Short mmCIF file of all heavy atoms in Angstrom, two decimals:
data_model
loop_
_atom_site.label_atom_id
_atom_site.label_comp_id
_atom_site.label_asym_id
_atom_site.label_seq_id
_atom_site.Cartn_x
_atom_site.Cartn_y
_atom_site.Cartn_z
N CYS D 1 -11.69 14.73 -11.96
CA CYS D 1 -11.44 13.53 -11.15
C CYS D 1 -9.94 13.39 -10.85
O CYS D 1 -9.16 14.18 -11.31
CB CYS D 1 -11.93 12.26 -11.89
SG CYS D 1 -11.67 12.15 -13.69
N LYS D 2 -9.60 12.40 -10.04
CA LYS D 2 -8.16 12.14 -9.68
C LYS D 2 -7.49 11.15 -10.61
O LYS D 2 -8.10 10.77 -11.60
CB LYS D 2 -8.09 11.65 -8.22
CG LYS D 2 -9.15 12.38 -7.33
CD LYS D 2 -8.73 13.87 -7.10
CE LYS D 2 -9.96 14.68 -6.65
NZ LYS D 2 -9.57 16.08 -6.38
N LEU D 3 -6.30 10.76 -10.27
CA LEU D 3 -5.53 9.80 -11.09
C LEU D 3 -5.05 8.69 -10.12
O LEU D 3 -5.19 8.82 -8.92
CB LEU D 3 -4.38 10.61 -11.74
CG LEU D 3 -3.64 9.88 -12.88
CD1 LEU D 3 -2.51 8.97 -12.33
CD2 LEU D 3 -4.63 9.09 -13.78
N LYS D 4 -4.47 7.64 -10.64
CA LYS D 4 -3.94 6.55 -9.80
C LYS D 4 -2.88 7.03 -8.84
O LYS D 4 -1.92 7.66 -9.24
CB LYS D 4 -3.39 5.44 -10.74
CG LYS D 4 -3.38 4.06 -10.04
CD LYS D 4 -2.21 3.93 -9.05
CE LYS D 4 -1.98 2.47 -8.64
NZ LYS D 4 -1.40 1.70 -9.77
N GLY D 5 -3.08 6.71 -7.60
CA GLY D 5 -2.17 7.15 -6.49
C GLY D 5 -2.48 8.51 -5.86
O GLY D 5 -1.68 9.03 -5.10
N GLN D 6 -3.61 9.09 -6.21
CA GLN D 6 -3.95 10.42 -5.63
C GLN D 6 -4.75 10.20 -4.32
O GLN D 6 -5.66 9.43 -4.30
CB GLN D 6 -4.84 11.23 -6.63
CG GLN D 6 -4.04 12.42 -7.17
CD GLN D 6 -4.89 13.24 -8.13
OE1 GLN D 6 -5.66 14.09 -7.74
NE2 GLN D 6 -4.83 13.00 -9.43
N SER D 7 -4.34 10.95 -3.34
CA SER D 7 -5.00 10.86 -2.00
C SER D 7 -6.52 10.99 -2.00
O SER D 7 -7.06 12.00 -2.40
CB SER D 7 -4.39 11.95 -1.11
OG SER D 7 -4.52 13.16 -1.82
N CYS D 8 -7.16 9.93 -1.59
CA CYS D 8 -8.69 9.92 -1.55
C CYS D 8 -9.19 8.85 -0.59
O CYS D 8 -8.51 7.87 -0.28
CB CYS D 8 -9.23 9.67 -2.96
SG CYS D 8 -8.66 8.28 -3.98
N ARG D 9 -10.42 9.07 -0.22
CA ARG D 9 -11.11 8.13 0.72
C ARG D 9 -11.49 6.78 0.03
O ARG D 9 -12.05 6.74 -1.02
CB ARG D 9 -12.41 8.81 1.25
CG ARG D 9 -12.45 8.77 2.77
CD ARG D 9 -13.75 9.34 3.32
NE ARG D 9 -13.80 9.21 4.79
CZ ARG D 9 -14.11 8.06 5.41
NH1 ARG D 9 -14.35 7.01 4.66
NH2 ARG D 9 -14.12 8.01 6.68
N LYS D 10 -11.18 5.74 0.78
CA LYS D 10 -11.44 4.34 0.28
C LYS D 10 -12.87 4.12 -0.24
O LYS D 10 -13.05 3.32 -1.14
CB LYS D 10 -11.14 3.36 1.46
CG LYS D 10 -11.94 3.81 2.73
CD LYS D 10 -12.19 2.56 3.63
CE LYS D 10 -13.47 1.82 3.21
NZ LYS D 10 -14.66 2.54 3.75
N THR D 11 -13.82 4.81 0.31
CA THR D 11 -15.25 4.70 -0.10
C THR D 11 -15.70 5.97 -0.87
O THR D 11 -16.81 6.42 -0.72
CB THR D 11 -16.08 4.45 1.19
OG1 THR D 11 -17.42 4.28 0.81
CG2 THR D 11 -16.07 5.65 2.17
N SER D 12 -14.79 6.50 -1.65
CA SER D 12 -15.11 7.71 -2.46
C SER D 12 -14.85 7.46 -3.95
O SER D 12 -15.61 7.87 -4.78
CB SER D 12 -14.19 8.85 -1.96
OG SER D 12 -14.59 10.02 -2.72
N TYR D 13 -13.76 6.81 -4.23
CA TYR D 13 -13.38 6.47 -5.63
C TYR D 13 -13.43 7.71 -6.53
O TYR D 13 -13.80 7.66 -7.66
CB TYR D 13 -14.35 5.36 -6.17
CG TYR D 13 -14.24 4.14 -5.23
CD1 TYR D 13 -15.22 3.89 -4.31
CD2 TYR D 13 -13.17 3.29 -5.33
CE1 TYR D 13 -15.12 2.77 -3.49
CE2 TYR D 13 -13.06 2.18 -4.51
CZ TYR D 13 -14.04 1.94 -3.57
OH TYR D 13 -13.95 0.84 -2.76
N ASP D 14 -13.03 8.81 -5.89
CA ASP D 14 -13.00 10.13 -6.58
C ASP D 14 -12.11 10.15 -7.78
O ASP D 14 -12.15 11.07 -8.62
CB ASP D 14 -12.53 11.15 -5.51
CG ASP D 14 -13.24 12.52 -5.79
OD1 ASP D 14 -12.79 13.20 -6.69
OD2 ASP D 14 -14.18 12.79 -5.11
N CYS D 15 -11.32 9.13 -7.94
CA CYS D 15 -10.36 9.01 -9.09
C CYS D 15 -11.18 8.73 -10.35
O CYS D 15 -12.25 8.18 -10.34
CB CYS D 15 -9.41 7.87 -8.78
SG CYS D 15 -9.09 7.61 -7.00
N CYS D 16 -10.59 9.20 -11.45
CA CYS D 16 -11.16 9.08 -12.81
C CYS D 16 -11.59 7.64 -13.03
O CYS D 16 -12.72 7.30 -13.34
CB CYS D 16 -10.14 9.53 -13.73
SG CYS D 16 -9.85 11.31 -13.89
N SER D 17 -10.57 6.81 -12.94
CA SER D 17 -10.71 5.32 -13.12
C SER D 17 -11.44 4.68 -11.94
O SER D 17 -11.93 3.56 -12.06
CB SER D 17 -9.30 4.72 -13.32
OG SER D 17 -8.60 5.09 -12.11
N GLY D 18 -11.49 5.38 -10.83
CA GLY D 18 -12.15 4.79 -9.61
C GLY D 18 -11.15 3.77 -9.00
O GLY D 18 -10.84 2.77 -9.66
N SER D 19 -10.67 4.01 -7.80
CA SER D 19 -9.68 3.06 -7.20
C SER D 19 -9.58 3.14 -5.66
O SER D 19 -9.42 2.14 -5.00
CB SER D 19 -8.37 3.31 -7.84
OG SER D 19 -8.11 4.67 -7.52
N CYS D 20 -9.59 4.39 -5.24
CA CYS D 20 -9.47 4.75 -3.78
C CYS D 20 -9.71 3.61 -2.78
O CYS D 20 -10.78 2.98 -2.76
CB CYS D 20 -10.46 5.89 -3.47
SG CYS D 20 -10.33 7.33 -4.57
N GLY D 21 -8.69 3.38 -1.96
CA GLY D 21 -8.69 2.34 -0.94
C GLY D 21 -7.28 1.77 -0.81
O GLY D 21 -7.07 0.65 -0.37
N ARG D 22 -6.33 2.56 -1.28
CA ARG D 22 -4.90 2.22 -1.29
C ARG D 22 -4.26 2.80 0.00
O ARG D 22 -3.13 3.26 -0.04
CB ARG D 22 -4.27 2.81 -2.60
CG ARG D 22 -3.08 1.98 -3.08
CD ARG D 22 -2.81 2.32 -4.57
NE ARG D 22 -1.40 2.00 -4.90
CZ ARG D 22 -1.01 0.79 -5.21
NH1 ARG D 22 -1.86 -0.18 -5.25
NH2 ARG D 22 0.26 0.61 -5.49
N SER D 23 -5.05 2.80 0.99
CA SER D 23 -4.73 3.33 2.39
C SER D 23 -4.79 4.88 2.39
O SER D 23 -3.99 5.55 3.01
CB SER D 23 -3.30 2.81 2.79
OG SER D 23 -2.32 3.72 2.31
N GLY D 24 -5.78 5.35 1.70
CA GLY D 24 -6.04 6.84 1.58
C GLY D 24 -5.44 7.37 0.27
O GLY D 24 -5.03 8.51 0.23
N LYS D 25 -5.42 6.51 -0.70
CA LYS D 25 -4.88 6.87 -2.06
C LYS D 25 -5.68 6.12 -3.14
O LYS D 25 -6.25 5.09 -2.85
CB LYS D 25 -3.36 6.49 -2.07
CG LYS D 25 -2.85 6.06 -3.42
CD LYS D 25 -1.37 5.55 -3.32
CE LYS D 25 -0.38 6.74 -3.31
NZ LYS D 25 0.82 6.38 -2.50
N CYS D 26 -5.67 6.65 -4.32
CA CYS D 26 -6.39 6.01 -5.45
C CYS D 26 -5.85 4.59 -5.75
O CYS D 26 -4.80 4.40 -6.36
CB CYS D 26 -6.27 6.91 -6.71
SG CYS D 26 -7.28 8.42 -6.65
#
């Protein structure tokens, strides 16, 4: 998974902690 501030889709939450929607970031 990703980490806080890692580039990802707002409706993906691919981050470990789940966050994505920071304008294309976790």
Side-chain angles (χ1 to χ4, degrees):
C1 40
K2 322 290 161 177
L3 195 275
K4 203 283 194 73
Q6 248 181 85
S7 53
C8 52
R9 233 186 175 280
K10 52 154 275 279
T11 182
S12 183
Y13 302 103
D14 213 280
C15 331
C16 285
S17 57
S19 59
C20 307
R22 208 162 157 83
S23 89
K25 149 187 277 148
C26 286

